[model samples]
Target: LGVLRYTLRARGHPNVTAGHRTTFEVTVDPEIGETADCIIGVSSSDSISTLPDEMKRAIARESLVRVILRTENGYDEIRGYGHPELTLDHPTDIVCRKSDYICSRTLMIRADKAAFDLDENLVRDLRKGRELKVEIIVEYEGHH
Candidate 1:
């Protein structure tokens, strides 16, 4: 069991408004033969709010959100933790738009048993016992 730590950088749209949302992408590169059993966590620097209805529903239903992971072959969608539930540790809400609010939540992803397609490269790298570089993308839709 090895722990690999990396920084996740988020890019927000310029002039973010009520309908606008933030998006992020994540990727993983493993050394070889490294197991894919790991957790992906996201901690926002500020509070996040203005969650779109779709995302809110998802959070309520599964306590997680879908994220796109890219690979040499293509991409796969997997579940990842989001606000309210996952952001309990370090919570803060900030204003993204007038009257609209945003909160930063800590998100984590565990790769052991889930219903998502794993990239071939990722599988190969993990099987070979190599270090893995995980990539993830997050989209936060503003409230309507």
Candidate 2:
């Protein structure tokens, strides 16, 4: 739970489907020079219902790291609340391509309840999106 470093991995599901879904990955390195473990966190936010048991367990193993998604052309705070923490990664230059199809803006996370922050402007876009895609990534601490 102290200082840890992780590398980004693939962010997708085993089965591609219609509508929307969450997919992400990250790897943990022990002692800064050794590979420790790999963790995956995925979820479906098209609705507010509880996530599946397998997905929840995977997230628990990888830590609570997550990503939030938004689309549009403005920033709002309403879309950023509820979720404990958020890391927008790149705010000013994190624009998704516009098209007839629905695209998602995403927010990354790697903290508990209050260790995340993002650009205020991005929040606004979450509300304006026709659709959204959110995902999470985490790696194991390897401590028992």
Candidate 3:
């Protein structure tokens, strides 16, 4: 079993207005693929007071969420890797107001039972203890 944990900080534009969309990228450790069983989790740092009820409902509807993982081969759907799809509440409740305003999640992938075949090169590098340098693209649509 292998465990990789880290936090990504995203900056918001002060000039940006509501309904603005922002995209950010985070690098996940290659060791994530090293084990046959893997888990990935994410959470949002936006405070409840800062988020409107409509936005909170959007999160529950999953219409305002867009997260993708990119590799050398191409972009892969996180759920395509056999990991359970994220819900409004996985690592934590989306409506939970906190001191921070970041959104995040952790995914669990099992190569042996993956929904789709993972990239061979990615698997190979993991076997050799090499860096997979997986990039996760996080897209957020502003809630108005």
Query: Sorted on lDDT, highest at the top, how do the candidates line up?
Result: 1, 3, 2
What are the Cα lDDT values of the candidates?
0.30, 0.25, 0.27
Clashes per candidate (backbone, < 3 Å): 37, 7, 24
- Model 2 TM-score, 2 decimals: 0.30
- Model 1 agreement with the true structure over 64-115: per-residue lDDT tens digits: 3444433234344455544443332222321111111223332333322231
Q: What is the TM-score of each candidate against the true structure?
A: 0.31, 0.30, 0.31
Q: Which 10 consecutive positions of candidate 3 have the poorest summed lDDT?
A: 12-21
Q: Give the TM-score of candidate 3.
A: 0.31
On the 0 to 100 scale, the lDDT of residue 56 in model 2 is 29
Q: What local lDDT does model 3 show for residue 103?
A: 38
TM-score of 1: 0.31
Error of 3 at 20 (Å): 37
The residue-by-residue lDDT of candidate 2 on 1-144, one tens digit each, is 422222222222222121111212221211111121111212222221133333323333324333443334422121111122212232111111111121122222322221123333333332222223333333334342
Between candidates 2 and 3, which one is better according to TM-score?
3
Candidate 1 has its poorest 10 consecutive residues by lDDT at 12-21
Q: What is the C-alpha RMSD of each candidate to the true structure, in Å?
A: 15.2, 17.0, 15.3
